[PDB]
Design a protein around this nucleic acid. Structure first.
Length: 174
RNA sequence: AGGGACUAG
C-alpha cells in the first residue's frame, strides 16, 4: 500500500461541533478511509478546529480534491494535502503557493521537458529555465491552483530527464 | 499542522 503521506488530507476550519463520525461520513463519498481524526485538546478534549483523513489510495484523494469546495456541519472546510511532521517547522511548509522551484536539472534539460512532466499535476501559466552567458541547472513553474504544488512537494525528489530533480515551493526573496 | 499508525535512521 502507498505511503500514508501521499494518501492523507489535513482538514482545517472545522466546526468545534464536528466529530470524527461526520467527518468520516462526508469523506467516504469519495472512497474508503483507513484513518480519521478530529484533533482535540489533551485536557479539555475540545476541538482544535482541524482534523485529518486518510484514503486507501491517492486516486481517492484526488477525487476528493477535484470535488471542492467541501462543507461539513455548515462550515466550508479547508482540505489540504498533509504536510509531513519532518517538514512542519521551516518557512514555506504551509505557505499555500502556486509557484514551484525546480533544481538539479543540469544543462541538458529544456523548458519543454518541464511541461511534459508537470502538465500532469495541473494546468500551467508559465515555465522559466535559468541561465546567463549556458544553463544554471534550475527553474520555475507556475500553476492555476495551489494544489498541484502541494501534491508535488509531498515528494522532495522528482525524476525528470535522467536527473534526481529537487522541488521546493517558490519563496519571494525571501 | 499530527492524535493513532509505522520494514530507512
Amino acid at each position: 500500500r502507498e505511503k500514508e503521506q501521499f494518501r492523507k488530507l489535513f482538514i482545517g476550519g472545522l466546526s468545534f461541533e464536528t466529530t470524527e463520525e461526520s467527518l468520516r461520513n462526508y469523506y467516504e463519498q469519495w472512497g474508503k478511509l483507513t484513518d480519521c481524526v478530529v484533533m482535540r485538546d489533551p485536557a479539555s478534549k475540545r476541538s482544535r478546529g482541524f482534523g485529518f483523513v486518510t484514503f486507501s489510495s491517492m486516486a481517492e484523494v484526488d477525487a476528493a480534491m477535484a470535488a471542492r469546495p467541501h462543507s461539513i456541519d455548515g462550515r466550508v472546510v479547508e482540505p489540504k494535502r498533509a504536510v509531513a511532521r519532518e517538514e512542519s517547522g521551516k518557512p514555506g511548509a504551509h505557505v499555500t503557493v502556486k509557484k514551484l522551484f525546480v533544481g538539479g536539472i543540469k544543462e541538458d534539460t529544456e523548458e519543454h521537458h518541464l511541461r511534459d512532466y508537470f502538465e500532469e499535476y495541473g494546468k500551467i501559466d508559465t515555465i522559466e529555465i535559468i541561465t546567463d552567458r549556458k544553463k544554471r541547472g534550475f527553474g520555475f513553474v507556475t500553476f492555476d491552483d495551489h494544489d498541484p504544488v502541494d501534491k508535488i512537494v509531498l515528494q522532495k525528489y522528482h525524476t525528470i530527464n535522467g536527473h534526481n530533480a529537487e522541488v521546493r515551493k517558490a519563496l519571494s526573496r525571501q
